[PDB]
Short mmCIF file of C-alpha atoms in Angstrom, two decimals:
data_model
loop_
_atom_site.label_atom_id
_atom_site.label_comp_id
_atom_site.label_asym_id
_atom_site.label_seq_id
_atom_site.Cartn_x
_atom_site.Cartn_y
_atom_site.Cartn_z
CA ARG M 6 -49.22 -6.70 -29.10
CA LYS M 7 -45.82 -5.75 -30.52
CA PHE M 8 -44.97 -2.16 -29.82
CA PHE M 9 -44.96 -0.18 -33.09
CA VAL M 10 -42.94 2.90 -33.98
CA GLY M 11 -43.08 4.61 -37.32
CA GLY M 12 -41.01 7.50 -38.53
CA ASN M 13 -42.63 9.91 -40.91
CA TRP M 14 -39.62 11.48 -42.57
CA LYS M 15 -41.36 14.45 -44.13
CA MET M 16 -38.49 16.59 -45.27
CA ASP M 17 -36.71 18.16 -48.16
CA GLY M 18 -34.63 15.01 -48.43
CA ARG M 19 -30.96 14.61 -49.11
CA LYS M 20 -28.69 11.61 -49.31
CA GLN M 21 -26.39 13.20 -46.75
CA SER M 22 -29.01 14.03 -44.09
CA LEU M 23 -30.94 10.81 -44.65
CA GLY M 24 -27.69 8.84 -44.57
CA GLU M 25 -26.84 10.28 -41.18
CA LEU M 26 -30.21 9.37 -39.78
CA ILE M 27 -29.94 5.87 -41.11
CA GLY M 28 -26.45 5.44 -39.68
CA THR M 29 -27.86 6.51 -36.35
CA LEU M 30 -30.80 4.07 -36.58
CA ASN M 31 -28.57 1.25 -37.76
CA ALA M 32 -26.39 1.71 -34.68
CA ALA M 33 -29.38 2.00 -32.40
CA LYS M 34 -30.91 -0.71 -30.27
CA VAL M 35 -34.23 -2.00 -31.38
CA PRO M 36 -35.93 -3.54 -28.38
CA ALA M 37 -37.05 -7.09 -29.10
CA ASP M 38 -40.70 -6.43 -28.57
CA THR M 39 -40.60 -3.57 -31.05
CA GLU M 40 -41.21 -3.15 -34.78
CA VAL M 41 -39.77 -0.10 -36.49
CA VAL M 42 -40.84 1.48 -39.74
CA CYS M 43 -39.34 4.48 -41.53
CA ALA M 44 -41.08 6.39 -44.27
CA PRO M 45 -38.80 8.49 -46.46
CA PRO M 46 -39.73 10.86 -49.25
CA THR M 47 -40.63 8.91 -52.35
CA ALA M 48 -37.45 9.71 -54.22
CA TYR M 49 -35.46 8.09 -51.37
CA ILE M 50 -37.34 4.87 -50.68
CA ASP M 51 -34.82 2.88 -52.68
CA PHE M 52 -31.84 4.61 -51.12
CA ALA M 53 -33.23 4.15 -47.64
CA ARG M 54 -34.00 0.46 -48.09
CA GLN M 55 -30.50 -0.10 -49.44
CA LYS M 56 -28.77 1.60 -46.46
CA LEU M 57 -31.09 0.62 -43.65
CA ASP M 58 -30.53 -2.45 -41.62
CA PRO M 59 -33.12 -5.12 -42.41
CA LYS M 60 -34.22 -4.95 -38.77
CA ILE M 61 -36.01 -1.82 -39.81
CA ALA M 62 -38.75 -1.66 -42.39
CA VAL M 63 -39.39 0.96 -45.04
CA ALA M 64 -42.73 2.59 -45.85
CA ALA M 65 -43.93 4.85 -48.58
CA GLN M 66 -45.55 8.08 -47.54
CA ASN M 67 -48.41 7.51 -49.95
CA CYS M 68 -49.63 5.50 -52.89
CA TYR M 69 -52.23 5.69 -55.63
CA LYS M 70 -55.23 3.44 -56.10
CA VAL M 71 -55.80 1.23 -59.07
CA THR M 72 -53.94 3.06 -61.78
CA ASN M 73 -55.76 4.49 -64.74
CA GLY M 74 -53.21 5.65 -67.25
CA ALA M 75 -51.78 8.74 -65.67
CA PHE M 76 -48.37 7.45 -64.55
CA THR M 77 -46.97 10.87 -63.55
CA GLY M 78 -49.35 10.58 -60.67
CA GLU M 79 -48.58 8.80 -57.45
CA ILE M 80 -46.23 5.91 -56.82
CA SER M 81 -47.97 2.60 -57.19
CA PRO M 82 -47.96 -0.22 -54.66
CA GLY M 83 -45.99 -2.25 -57.22
CA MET M 84 -43.29 0.35 -57.33
CA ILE M 85 -43.26 0.66 -53.56
CA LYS M 86 -42.79 -3.09 -53.25
CA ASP M 87 -40.25 -3.06 -56.04
CA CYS M 88 -38.14 -0.48 -54.23
CA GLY M 89 -38.26 -2.77 -51.22
CA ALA M 90 -40.71 -1.00 -49.02
CA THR M 91 -43.23 -3.21 -47.20
CA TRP M 92 -45.57 -0.60 -45.77
CA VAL M 93 -47.47 2.48 -46.87
CA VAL M 94 -48.84 5.35 -44.86
CA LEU M 95 -52.42 6.27 -45.89
CA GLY M 96 -54.89 8.90 -44.75
CA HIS M 97 -52.16 10.88 -43.04
CA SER M 98 -53.29 14.21 -41.77
CA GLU M 99 -51.47 16.20 -44.42
CA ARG M 100 -53.04 14.18 -47.21
CA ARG M 101 -56.49 14.49 -45.68
CA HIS M 102 -56.28 18.14 -44.74
CA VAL M 103 -53.84 19.90 -47.03
CA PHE M 104 -54.13 17.90 -50.24
CA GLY M 105 -57.77 17.02 -49.84
CA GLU M 106 -57.81 13.26 -50.11
CA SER M 107 -61.33 11.94 -49.59
CA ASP M 108 -62.46 9.33 -47.13
CA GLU M 109 -63.47 7.20 -50.09
CA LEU M 110 -60.13 7.61 -51.86
CA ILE M 111 -58.31 6.52 -48.75
CA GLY M 112 -60.45 3.42 -48.43
CA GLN M 113 -59.78 2.63 -52.03
CA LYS M 114 -56.02 3.09 -51.47
CA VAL M 115 -56.03 0.84 -48.43
CA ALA M 116 -57.78 -1.87 -50.36
CA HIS M 117 -55.38 -1.59 -53.24
CA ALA M 118 -52.24 -1.56 -51.12
CA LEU M 119 -53.35 -4.60 -49.17
CA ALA M 120 -54.22 -6.48 -52.34
CA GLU M 121 -50.82 -5.68 -53.70
CA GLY M 122 -49.34 -7.17 -50.55
CA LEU M 123 -48.19 -4.19 -48.57
CA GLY M 124 -48.69 -3.40 -44.97
CA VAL M 125 -50.81 -0.38 -44.12
CA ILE M 126 -50.55 2.33 -41.58
CA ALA M 127 -54.02 3.86 -41.70
CA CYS M 128 -54.50 7.26 -40.23
CA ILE M 129 -57.52 8.88 -38.69
CA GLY M 130 -58.11 11.97 -36.66
CA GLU M 131 -60.48 14.66 -35.56
CA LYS M 132 -59.83 18.35 -36.07
CA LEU M 133 -59.85 20.73 -33.14
CA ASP M 134 -63.22 22.35 -33.78
CA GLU M 135 -64.47 18.86 -34.02
CA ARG M 136 -62.78 18.04 -30.73
CA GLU M 137 -64.39 20.87 -28.87
CA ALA M 138 -67.68 20.32 -30.62
CA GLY M 139 -68.03 16.85 -29.16
CA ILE M 140 -67.89 15.01 -32.45
CA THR M 141 -64.50 13.32 -31.98
CA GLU M 142 -65.93 9.86 -31.53
CA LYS M 143 -68.28 10.18 -34.47
CA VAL M 144 -65.55 11.49 -36.67
CA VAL M 145 -62.87 8.93 -35.90
CA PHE M 146 -65.45 6.15 -36.03
CA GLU M 147 -66.70 7.08 -39.48
CA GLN M 148 -63.11 7.34 -40.66
CA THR M 149 -62.29 3.97 -39.19
CA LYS M 150 -65.35 2.37 -40.75
CA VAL M 151 -64.33 3.30 -44.24
CA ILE M 152 -60.87 1.87 -43.62
CA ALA M 153 -62.46 -1.21 -42.03
CA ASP M 154 -64.72 -1.74 -45.00
CA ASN M 155 -61.60 -2.19 -47.04
CA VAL M 156 -59.74 -4.61 -44.82
CA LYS M 157 -60.10 -8.35 -45.02
CA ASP M 158 -57.02 -9.24 -43.01
CA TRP M 159 -56.01 -6.95 -40.18
CA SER M 160 -52.71 -8.67 -39.65
CA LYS M 161 -50.97 -6.18 -41.90
CA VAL M 162 -52.83 -3.09 -40.72
CA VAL M 163 -51.99 -0.57 -38.10
CA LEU M 164 -54.28 2.22 -37.08
CA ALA M 165 -52.83 5.60 -36.30
CA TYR M 166 -54.86 8.16 -34.48
CA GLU M 167 -53.64 11.63 -35.39
CA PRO M 168 -55.59 14.31 -33.60
CA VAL M 169 -55.00 17.12 -35.97
CA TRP M 170 -55.16 19.76 -33.26
CA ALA M 171 -51.91 18.13 -32.27
CA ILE M 172 -50.38 19.46 -35.40
CA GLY M 173 -50.53 23.14 -36.30
CA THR M 174 -52.71 24.54 -33.58
CA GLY M 175 -52.07 25.54 -30.01
CA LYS M 176 -53.04 22.49 -27.97
CA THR M 177 -51.40 19.46 -26.36
CA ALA M 178 -52.30 15.85 -25.59
CA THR M 179 -51.74 13.71 -22.50
CA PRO M 180 -51.36 10.01 -21.68
CA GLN M 181 -54.95 10.27 -20.44
CA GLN M 182 -56.44 11.76 -23.61
CA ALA M 183 -54.49 9.31 -25.77
CA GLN M 184 -55.95 6.40 -23.82
CA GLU M 185 -59.50 7.68 -24.07
CA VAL M 186 -59.47 8.09 -27.85
CA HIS M 187 -57.37 4.94 -28.21
CA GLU M 188 -59.58 2.88 -25.89
CA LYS M 189 -62.63 3.84 -27.96
CA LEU M 190 -60.93 2.69 -31.16
CA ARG M 191 -60.47 -0.83 -29.80
CA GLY M 192 -64.09 -0.94 -28.74
CA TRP M 193 -65.19 -0.13 -32.28
CA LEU M 194 -62.99 -2.89 -33.57
CA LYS M 195 -64.30 -5.32 -31.01
CA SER M 196 -67.98 -4.84 -31.92
CA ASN M 197 -67.55 -4.06 -35.62
CA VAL M 198 -65.00 -6.68 -36.51
CA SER M 199 -63.93 -9.10 -33.78
CA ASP M 200 -62.57 -9.33 -30.26
CA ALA M 201 -59.61 -11.19 -31.68
CA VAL M 202 -58.96 -8.38 -34.14
CA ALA M 203 -59.49 -5.76 -31.46
CA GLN M 204 -56.94 -7.44 -29.21
CA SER M 205 -54.23 -7.95 -31.85
CA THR M 206 -54.51 -4.65 -33.65
CA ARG M 207 -51.93 -1.99 -32.83
CA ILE M 208 -53.29 1.47 -32.37
CA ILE M 209 -50.50 4.05 -32.47
CA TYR M 210 -50.56 7.74 -31.64
CA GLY M 211 -49.60 10.46 -34.05
CA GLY M 212 -50.09 13.74 -32.21
CA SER M 213 -46.85 15.65 -31.75
CA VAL M 214 -44.68 13.28 -29.80
CA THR M 215 -41.30 14.17 -28.36
CA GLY M 216 -38.72 12.38 -26.28
CA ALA M 217 -40.19 14.30 -23.43
CA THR M 218 -43.71 13.02 -23.83
CA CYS M 219 -43.26 9.54 -25.20
CA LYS M 220 -42.88 7.38 -22.10
CA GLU M 221 -46.15 8.23 -20.43
CA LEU M 222 -48.00 7.62 -23.66
CA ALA M 223 -46.34 4.25 -24.12
CA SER M 224 -47.42 3.06 -20.66
CA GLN M 225 -51.08 3.23 -21.53
CA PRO M 226 -52.72 -0.16 -22.07
CA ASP M 227 -54.21 0.78 -25.43
CA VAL M 228 -51.35 2.80 -26.97
CA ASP M 229 -49.25 0.43 -28.96
CA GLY M 230 -46.79 2.87 -30.41
CA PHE M 231 -46.36 6.09 -32.35
CA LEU M 232 -46.45 7.62 -35.79
CA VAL M 233 -43.77 10.23 -35.31
CA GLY M 234 -43.57 13.47 -37.22
CA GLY M 235 -40.76 15.98 -36.75
CA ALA M 236 -39.07 14.05 -33.97
CA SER M 237 -38.47 11.17 -36.34
CA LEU M 238 -35.82 13.37 -37.89
CA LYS M 239 -33.98 13.76 -34.62
CA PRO M 240 -31.73 11.71 -32.33
CA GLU M 241 -34.66 11.63 -29.94
CA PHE M 242 -36.32 9.30 -32.39
CA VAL M 243 -34.19 6.61 -30.81
CA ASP M 244 -35.59 7.43 -27.38
CA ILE M 245 -39.07 7.13 -28.87
CA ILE M 246 -38.23 3.70 -30.19
CA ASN M 247 -37.31 2.72 -26.66
CA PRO N 4 -23.53 26.92 -84.64
CA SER N 5 -25.99 24.15 -85.30
CA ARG N 6 -28.45 23.28 -82.55
CA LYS N 7 -27.45 20.01 -80.96
CA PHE N 8 -30.06 17.27 -81.62
CA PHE N 9 -31.86 16.48 -78.38
CA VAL N 10 -33.73 13.33 -77.53
CA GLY N 11 -35.72 12.92 -74.37
CA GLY N 12 -37.47 9.76 -73.29
CA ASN N 13 -40.55 10.27 -71.23
CA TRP N 14 -40.64 7.02 -69.25
CA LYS N 15 -44.16 7.13 -67.97
CA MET N 16 -44.67 3.67 -66.63
CA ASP N 17 -45.49 1.62 -63.61
CA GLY N 18 -41.81 1.23 -63.01
CA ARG N 19 -39.69 -1.73 -62.22
CA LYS N 20 -35.99 -2.27 -61.63
CA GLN N 21 -36.04 -5.16 -63.95
CA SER N 22 -37.74 -3.52 -66.92
CA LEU N 23 -36.06 -0.15 -66.36
CA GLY N 24 -32.65 -1.71 -65.79
CA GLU N 25 -33.01 -3.65 -68.98
CA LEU N 26 -33.89 -0.55 -70.93
CA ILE N 27 -30.96 1.31 -69.41
CA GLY N 28 -28.78 -1.68 -70.22
CA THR N 29 -29.82 -1.43 -73.81
CA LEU N 30 -28.97 2.28 -73.90
CA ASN N 31 -25.64 1.72 -72.25
CA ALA N 32 -24.83 -0.92 -74.84
CA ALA N 33 -26.05 1.15 -77.75
CA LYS N 34 -23.73 3.49 -79.51
CA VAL N 35 -25.27 6.75 -78.51
CA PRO N 36 -23.74 9.32 -80.83
CA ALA N 37 -21.66 12.12 -79.43
CA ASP N 38 -23.74 14.44 -81.50
CA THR N 39 -27.01 13.65 -79.69
CA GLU N 40 -27.97 14.95 -76.30
CA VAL N 41 -29.90 12.20 -74.57
CA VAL N 42 -32.13 12.58 -71.55
CA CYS N 43 -34.25 9.96 -69.74
CA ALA N 44 -37.05 10.79 -67.43
CA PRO N 45 -38.09 7.90 -65.21
CA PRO N 46 -40.79 7.80 -62.54
CA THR N 47 -39.85 9.60 -59.32
CA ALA N 48 -39.46 6.34 -57.40
CA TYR N 49 -36.73 5.72 -59.98
CA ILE N 50 -34.90 9.05 -60.06
CA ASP N 51 -31.73 7.75 -58.40
CA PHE N 52 -31.75 4.20 -59.76
CA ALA N 53 -31.46 5.09 -63.45
CA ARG N 54 -28.65 7.55 -62.76
CA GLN N 55 -26.95 4.62 -61.04
CA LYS N 56 -27.15 2.37 -64.10
CA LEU N 57 -27.44 4.64 -67.14
CA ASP N 58 -24.26 5.80 -68.87
CA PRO N 59 -22.67 9.02 -67.63
CA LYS N 60 -23.15 10.39 -71.15
CA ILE N 61 -26.91 10.02 -70.70
CA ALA N 62 -28.67 12.66 -68.59
CA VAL N 63 -31.52 12.02 -66.18
CA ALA N 64 -34.69 14.11 -65.81
CA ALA N 65 -37.49 14.29 -63.30
CA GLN N 66 -40.96 14.08 -64.73
CA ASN N 67 -42.10 17.03 -62.60
CA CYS N 68 -41.22 19.17 -59.63
CA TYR N 69 -42.59 21.73 -57.23
CA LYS N 70 -42.03 25.46 -56.92
CA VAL N 71 -41.07 27.08 -53.62
CA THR N 72 -42.18 24.82 -50.81
CA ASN N 73 -43.81 25.25 -47.48
CA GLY N 74 -44.44 22.32 -45.19
CA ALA N 75 -46.32 19.69 -47.11
CA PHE N 76 -43.25 17.66 -47.95
CA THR N 77 -45.42 14.74 -49.12
CA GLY N 78 -46.13 16.88 -52.14
CA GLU N 79 -44.15 16.97 -55.32
CA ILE N 80 -40.44 16.34 -55.36
CA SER N 81 -38.28 19.38 -55.03
CA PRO N 82 -35.57 20.60 -57.43
CA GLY N 83 -33.06 20.15 -54.62
CA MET N 84 -34.09 16.52 -54.31
CA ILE N 85 -33.91 16.03 -58.07
CA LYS N 86 -30.40 17.47 -58.19
CA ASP N 87 -29.47 15.44 -55.11
CA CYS N 88 -30.54 12.29 -56.86
CA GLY N 89 -28.36 13.21 -59.81
CA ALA N 90 -30.89 14.43 -62.29
CA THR N 91 -29.93 17.54 -64.22
CA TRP N 92 -33.27 18.18 -66.00
CA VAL N 93 -37.02 18.46 -65.27
CA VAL N 94 -39.97 18.10 -67.59
CA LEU N 95 -42.49 20.84 -67.00
CA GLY N 96 -45.88 21.59 -68.50
CA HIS N 97 -46.27 18.11 -69.94
CA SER N 98 -49.75 17.73 -71.44
CA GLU N 99 -50.68 15.17 -68.84
CA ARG N 100 -49.93 17.60 -66.08
CA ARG N 101 -51.81 20.43 -67.80
CA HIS N 102 -54.81 18.54 -69.17
CA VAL N 103 -55.41 15.76 -66.68
CA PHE N 104 -54.03 17.07 -63.42
CA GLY N 105 -54.98 20.65 -64.15
CA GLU N 106 -51.71 22.45 -63.70
CA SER N 107 -52.11 26.12 -64.56
CA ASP N 108 -49.96 28.21 -66.84
CA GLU N 109 -49.12 30.23 -63.81
CA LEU N 110 -47.97 27.24 -61.80
CA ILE N 111 -45.83 26.00 -64.66
CA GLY N 112 -44.14 29.38 -64.86
CA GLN N 113 -43.39 29.31 -61.12
CA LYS N 114 -41.96 25.81 -61.54
CA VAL N 115 -39.77 26.87 -64.45
CA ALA N 116 -38.36 29.80 -62.52
CA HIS N 117 -37.68 27.73 -59.45
CA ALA N 118 -36.12 24.84 -61.32
CA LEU N 119 -33.69 27.14 -63.11
CA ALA N 120 -32.91 28.94 -59.86
CA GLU N 121 -31.88 25.65 -58.32
CA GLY N 122 -29.60 24.80 -61.22
CA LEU N 123 -31.65 22.35 -63.24
CA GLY N 124 -32.21 22.30 -66.94
CA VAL N 125 -35.83 22.52 -68.10
CA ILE N 126 -37.77 20.80 -70.78
CA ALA N 127 -40.81 23.06 -71.16
CA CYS N 128 -43.82 21.58 -72.86
CA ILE N 129 -46.44 23.50 -74.79
CA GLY N 130 -49.23 22.59 -77.13
CA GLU N 131 -52.79 23.00 -78.21
CA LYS N 132 -55.76 20.76 -77.77
CA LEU N 133 -58.07 19.71 -80.58
CA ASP N 134 -60.82 22.22 -79.84
CA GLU N 135 -58.22 24.96 -79.84
CA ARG N 136 -56.79 23.87 -83.16
CA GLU N 137 -60.25 23.53 -84.78
CA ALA N 138 -61.16 27.00 -83.57
CA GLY N 139 -58.12 28.33 -85.36
CA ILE N 140 -56.24 29.33 -82.24
CA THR N 141 -53.16 27.10 -82.35
CA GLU N 142 -50.68 29.98 -82.57
CA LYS N 143 -52.45 31.97 -79.92
CA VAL N 144 -52.52 29.10 -77.46
CA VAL N 145 -48.90 27.97 -77.87
CA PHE N 146 -47.56 31.58 -77.99
CA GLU N 147 -49.29 32.34 -74.69
CA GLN N 148 -47.96 29.16 -73.08
CA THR N 149 -44.48 30.02 -74.40
CA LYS N 150 -44.79 33.60 -73.13
CA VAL N 151 -45.45 32.33 -69.62
CA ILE N 152 -42.38 30.10 -69.73
CA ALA N 153 -40.34 32.92 -71.28
CA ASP N 154 -41.33 35.36 -68.54
CA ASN N 155 -39.74 32.92 -66.17
CA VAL N 156 -36.57 32.32 -68.13
CA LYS N 157 -33.43 34.43 -67.88
CA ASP N 158 -30.84 32.14 -69.35
CA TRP N 159 -32.10 30.05 -72.28
CA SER N 160 -28.88 27.99 -72.18
CA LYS N 161 -30.54 25.41 -69.98
CA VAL N 162 -34.00 25.38 -71.61
CA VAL N 163 -35.47 23.22 -74.32
CA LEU N 164 -38.98 23.65 -75.69
CA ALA N 165 -41.11 20.65 -76.54
CA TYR N 166 -44.18 21.02 -78.78
CA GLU N 167 -46.85 18.52 -77.96
CA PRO N 168 -49.72 18.40 -80.47
CA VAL N 169 -52.25 17.42 -77.91
CA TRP N 170 -54.82 17.60 -80.73
CA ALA N 171 -53.20 14.63 -82.39
CA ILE N 172 -52.65 12.50 -79.33
CA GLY N 173 -55.39 10.05 -78.46
CA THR N 174 -57.90 11.90 -80.61
CA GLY N 175 -57.75 10.10 -83.92
CA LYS N 176 -56.13 13.05 -85.67
CA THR N 177 -52.75 12.54 -87.20
CA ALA N 178 -50.06 15.20 -87.40
CA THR N 179 -48.04 15.21 -90.60
CA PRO N 180 -44.33 16.02 -90.68
CA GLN N 181 -45.29 19.17 -92.58
CA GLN N 182 -47.73 20.18 -89.84
CA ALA N 183 -45.09 19.68 -87.15
CA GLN N 184 -42.63 21.89 -89.02
CA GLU N 185 -45.20 24.68 -89.31
CA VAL N 186 -45.73 24.79 -85.55
CA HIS N 187 -42.00 24.54 -84.83
CA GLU N 188 -41.22 27.34 -87.27
CA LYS N 189 -43.82 29.61 -85.68
CA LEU N 190 -42.49 28.97 -82.19
CA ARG N 191 -38.97 29.89 -83.21
CA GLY N 192 -40.38 33.05 -84.72
CA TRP N 193 -42.00 33.96 -81.44
CA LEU N 194 -38.63 33.50 -79.81
CA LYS N 195 -37.10 35.79 -82.42
CA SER N 196 -39.80 38.42 -82.02
CA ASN N 197 -39.99 38.29 -78.23
CA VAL N 198 -36.57 37.38 -76.91
CA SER N 199 -33.70 37.62 -79.41
CA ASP N 200 -32.41 36.33 -82.74
CA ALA N 201 -29.68 34.51 -80.90
CA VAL N 202 -32.13 32.76 -78.59
CA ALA N 203 -34.33 31.83 -81.52
CA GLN N 204 -31.43 30.33 -83.44
CA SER N 205 -29.95 28.50 -80.46
CA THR N 206 -32.95 27.15 -78.56
CA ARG N 207 -33.82 23.50 -79.28
CA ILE N 208 -37.45 22.99 -80.10
CA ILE N 209 -38.25 19.32 -79.85
CA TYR N 210 -41.24 17.34 -81.11
CA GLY N 211 -43.48 15.66 -78.58
CA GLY N 212 -46.01 14.16 -81.00
CA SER N 213 -46.13 10.53 -81.96
CA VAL N 214 -42.72 9.42 -83.07
CA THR N 215 -41.60 5.96 -83.98
CA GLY N 216 -38.68 4.16 -85.48
CA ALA N 217 -40.28 4.37 -88.89
CA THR N 218 -41.13 8.07 -88.62
CA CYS N 219 -38.30 9.64 -86.72
CA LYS N 220 -35.96 10.41 -89.64
CA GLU N 221 -38.48 12.35 -91.71
CA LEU N 222 -39.42 14.38 -88.67
CA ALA N 223 -35.78 14.97 -87.79
CA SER N 224 -35.24 16.24 -91.31
CA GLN N 225 -37.60 19.13 -90.70
CA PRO N 226 -35.53 22.34 -90.41
CA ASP N 227 -37.11 23.59 -87.20
CA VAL N 228 -37.32 20.23 -85.43
CA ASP N 229 -34.40 19.81 -83.06
CA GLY N 230 -35.27 16.42 -81.71
CA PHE N 231 -37.96 14.58 -79.77
CA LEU N 232 -39.75 14.16 -76.49
CA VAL N 233 -40.54 10.49 -76.92
CA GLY N 234 -43.56 9.03 -75.24
CA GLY N 235 -44.47 5.38 -75.56
CA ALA N 236 -41.69 4.47 -78.01
CA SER N 237 -39.15 5.49 -75.39
CA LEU N 238 -39.88 2.26 -73.53
CA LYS N 239 -39.01 0.22 -76.57
CA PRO N 240 -35.93 -0.91 -78.52
CA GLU N 241 -36.73 1.58 -81.25
CA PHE N 242 -35.81 4.29 -78.77
CA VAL N 243 -32.24 3.65 -79.95
CA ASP N 244 -33.31 4.15 -83.55
CA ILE N 245 -34.96 7.43 -82.53
CA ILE N 246 -31.78 8.53 -80.83
CA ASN N 247 -30.00 7.86 -84.09
CA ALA N 248 -32.50 9.66 -86.26
#
């Protein structure tokens, strides 16, 4: 499986700050066995695609489902494609847990984005209370199932496990924990979909990853990459890529 | 002095470079009169593209924004971002935001204050729904909406008010030019009563009801109508005719 690194550029964006990042990425080495995706704020997808080296892909942070009037609402897959992005991030923790996007809405979005010919980074994760309460497997699995129900071809899908307790709470993950949760994901895919799908499908980690903690996580047999939050905005993002 | 005629195009669409670029091309090629202030509000995804094709004379607006932010960057575009992308206006309180996405009067006020703080112009939308109008409360509803905006405005220099007769949009009710003038006249009066004579005389109040190439000139002739917030016609060639009303 090709190693997969995504950068979730959640920020109060500017052409100057974004430009600097891009210049840095453009000058950076992308290892040959690696696929890199950057997701700017929506206003900057076009700008980013224009400045970024084609070696690096662009993702939208979100999209809407089949549109129903209401254009002031979210960017459509058509727009995302039009602006030259080839991926979308869906079910990201912030959308799930701050903005209240439903499991069903996410599944609908995945289906729509895929139909419109985008790649999908589909995000799942348990909350802390859930972690402690021994319902992590049940929670991620149900989340995955709804995403899975909306995927015909997995070739353009990447799963991102984001244990929420790894944003905004006081607890930390380890290469061990990542493997456990990650290993289980593949098993669900193997029984539920296919062994071929389970083998080829990248499962990336989205807990808070830093240049400090990236290498051990990468070494795990079932961690195929990262969905990076704050670190994506830093020079250490390059270290993460490598 | 006379209020400068103001025309905004509310480009609510599933946007494309090709269609948008063509529309901008048409505007660039048109003889936009010096005496008309023209503003185009594309989808967010196209907040930097238009400003890269449209004529400098033409001004770009965001369709919405957020108030003070905290985390949650995936949320609405900020005023800083809008400015950064070269837009100098934002449309706030648009009926679609109020009546479909449920934006509160309070939220709109916070947005107005923040947008102005950050150096943007504001197109502030007000208007009454059909039940409100039937119940005889048109003035009450629009005055209250206007009060909320007003409470968040210090300098009116960079504000334009747009009256949207929500009651006559998608309902089967038709607003007559006479009806539009009545609402516009009342709103100016509120400004006079509640802010200043100078503000009342100087503030553009633009019409956000259905306007077309065939109807623009009669509407523009109304004494208290300072221009338009153009919806669907703004995506069409007759948008130039409207500009020239």
